[PDB]
Amino acid sequence: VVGGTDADEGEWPWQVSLHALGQGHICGASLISPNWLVSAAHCYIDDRGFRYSDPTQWTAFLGLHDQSQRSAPGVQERRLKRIISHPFFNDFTFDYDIALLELEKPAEYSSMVRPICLPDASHVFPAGKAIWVTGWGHTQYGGTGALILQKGEIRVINQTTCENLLPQQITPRMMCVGFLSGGVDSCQGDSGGPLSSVEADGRIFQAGVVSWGDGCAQRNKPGVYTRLPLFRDWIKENTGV
Ligand SMILES: CC(C)c1cc(C(C)C)c(S(=O)(=O)N[C@@H](Cc2cccc(C(=N)N)c2)C(=O)N2CCN(C(=O)C3CCN(C(=N)N)CC3)CC2)c(C(C)C)c1
């Protein structure tokens, strides 16, 4: 997260950290139920030197605050039983960049580990609404990750403006969130994390999945996120949640 600040401990109990065998933190995810997490499909694409698609190559840390303190009280460690990438995901266009990760063993709800609420299919997060992006990603484009979880406040951007800012690249499954002037944006390592939207009663709903961006916090290059409402039914049919 670029342009953010340290989150308070336990402030985002649904934020999950995903480590790949021997590589440390690679992606974030969100707790949506005792056995399921939501993340981005691009995190689980194999490459010649590592099978990111293999659930056994990953470890999920729930309740984590500081990467250098992964054993602290309240932190839970879990392995993945399965990784379900959206069948329509496209590595080139990045359309349908969303994934469901099934935990090997049930997460235990506590004050530091709590699921985020999922928005119904017809819900629309309005342009201009303040949203929160969180993660252990780089704090600068061309910088380094963060030990302490970061949070940044950004705003939903009009779809038309989004398409126009990134011509031939924005699909209806994507949503621009941030600022045209930059300043605050998610970045490398934040991929797969959730956008948290405070709703009518104070409860927080996932407004999106950190997907991609041209650089980070660059002027006229806001972060692009995968929408959640559009996948409510997909999530239900695959996870029962
Ligand atoms: C080599 C390619 C893919 C690549 C593309 C980009 C962008 C121009 C699209 C970049 S980047 O810096 O402008 N942006 C990163 C970091 C990022 C991430 C999320 C949000 C933001 C934001 N500013 N809001 C930024 C980026 O949008 N990605 C997405 C695409 N990407 C991948 O799909 C890799 C995932 C891991 N992997 C496998 N498991 N096989 C290889 C492919 C990497 C990060 C980069 C960076 C890494 C130099 C690379």
CA distance 57 to 96: 23
- Closest among 175, 218, 180 to 194, alpha carbons compared: 175
| 1-12+116-229 and 13-115+230-241, same CATH topology | yes
Pocket test of ligand 1: the residue of 21, 42, 157 to mutate, having most ligand atoms within 8 Å of its CB, is 42
Q: Is the CB of 50 under 6 A from ligand 1?
A: no
Alpha-carbon torsion angle 223, 210, 139, 80, nearest 10: -170
Which is catalytic among the residues 97, 186, 190, 211? Answer: 97
Q: Which fold, 1-12+116-229?
A: Thrombin, subunit H (2.40.10)
Backbone angles phi, psi at 89, to 5 degrees: -55, 140
Q: Whose CA is nearest to atom 19 of ligand 1?
A: 212
Contacts of 37 by beta carbon, 8 Å cutoff, 6+ apart: 16, 29, 30, 31, 60, 100, 101, 102, 103
- Closest among 46, 40, 52 to 224, alpha carbons compared: 40
3-state secondary structure the chain: CECCEECCCCCCCCEEEEEECCCEEEEEEEECCCCEEEECHHHHCCECCECCCCHHHEEEEECCCECCCCCCCCCEEEEEEEEEECCCCCCCCCCCCCEEEEECCCCCCCCCCCCCECCCCCCCCCCCCEEEEEECCCCCCCCCCCCECEEEEEEECCHHHHHHHCCCCCCCCEEEEECCCCCCECCCCCCCCEEEEECCCCCEEEEEEEEECCCCCCCCCCEEEECCHHHHHHHHHHHCC
CA distance 186 to 188: 7
CA of 213 to the centre of ligand 1 (A): 7
Tell me the CA end-to-end span of the chain in Å, nearest whole number: 29
- Note whether 203 and 117 are within 8 A (CB): yes
Q: Which atom of ligand 1 is nearest to the CA of 42?
A: 33
Q: Is 97 a known active-site residue? A: yes
CA atoms within 13 A on the CB side of 188: 9
Q: Which atom of ligand 1 is nearest to the CA of 211?
A: 19
Specify the CATH class of 13-115+230-241 in words. mainly beta
Q: Which atom of ligand 1 is nearest to the CA of 189?
A: 18
> Domain coordinates of the chain in residue numbers?
1-12+116-229, 13-115+230-241
CA of 26 to the centre of ligand 1 (A): 12
- Note whether 41 and 97 are within 8 A (CB): yes
